[PDB]
């Protein structure tokens, strides 16, 4: 019975398992955000250039 | 589609976005155009590949 | 810190780093992830009583 309340006590009880999906979404988000950099070129839009 | 010289590719659908009168282009996180106004008629359009 | 190494003490070079996006923001997250890990390892191996 204590296990039922302990899990519902704090939301951070699943920190060891929550960080797995947060890191995956964090790294993937930066990859698409990097597409806006022009890398010293005229513009970041390949269709426009 | 080719609006004012901006080449692109996708399906044009009706958009509920509320552009201010002095704005013409909408962009996402990846700096890719998603909303654009017809130069002749003042309705707003949505872009999705 | 990236700005002190790649373009240290120069404002002209500091501006040119912004056009690359957020490369060195990723590095700061990388080196701080292992930094916390080092302080963690001492706690499982020693702080057991």
UniProtKB/Swiss-Prot annotation, chain A:
Stated role: Subunit of the fusion protein that is processed upon entry into the host cell. Mediates fusion of the virion and cellular membranes by functioning as a class I viral fusion protein. Contains a viral fusion peptide that is unmasked after S2 cleavage. This cleavage can occur at the cell membrane by host TMPRSS2 or during endocytosis by host CSTL. In either case, this triggers an extensive and irreversible conformational change that leads to fusion of the viral envelope with the cellular cytoplasmic membrane, releasing viral genomic RNA into the host cell cytoplasm.
Effect ascribed to mutating residue 19 to N: In strain: Delta/B.1.617.2, Mu/B.1.621
Coiled-coil boundaries: 18-49
The protein, known as: Spike protein S2'
Residues of the full protein shown: 932 to 980 of 1273
Result for mutant: residue 23 to H: In strain: Omicron/BA.1, Omicron/BA.2, Omicron/BA.2.12.1, Omicron/BA.2.75, Omicron/BA.4, Omicron/BA.5, Omicron/BQ.1.1, Omicron/XBB.1.5, Omicron/EG.5.1
Region (Heptad repeat 1): 1-39
Source superkingdom: Viruses
Gene for this chain: S
């Amino acid at each position: 019975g204590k296990i039922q309340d302990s899990l519902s006590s704090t939301p951070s009880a699943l920190g060891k398992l929550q960080d797995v999906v947060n890191q995956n979404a964090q790294a993937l988000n930066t990859l698409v955000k990097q597409l806006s950099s022009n890398f010293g070129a005229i513009s970041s839009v390949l269709n426009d250039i | 589609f080719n609006f004012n010289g901006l080449t692109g590719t996708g399906v044009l659908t009706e958009s509920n976005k509320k552009f201010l009168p002095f704005q013409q282009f909408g962009r996402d996180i990846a700096d890719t155009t998603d909303a654009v106004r017809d130069p002749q008629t003042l309705e707003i359009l949505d872009i999705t590949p | 810190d990236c700005t002190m190494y790649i373009c240290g003490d120069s404002t002209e070079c500091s501006n040119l780093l912004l056009q690359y996006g957020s490369f060195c923001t990723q590095l700061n997250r990388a080196l701080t992830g292992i930094a916390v890990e080092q302080d963690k390892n001492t706690q499982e191996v020693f702080a057991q009583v």
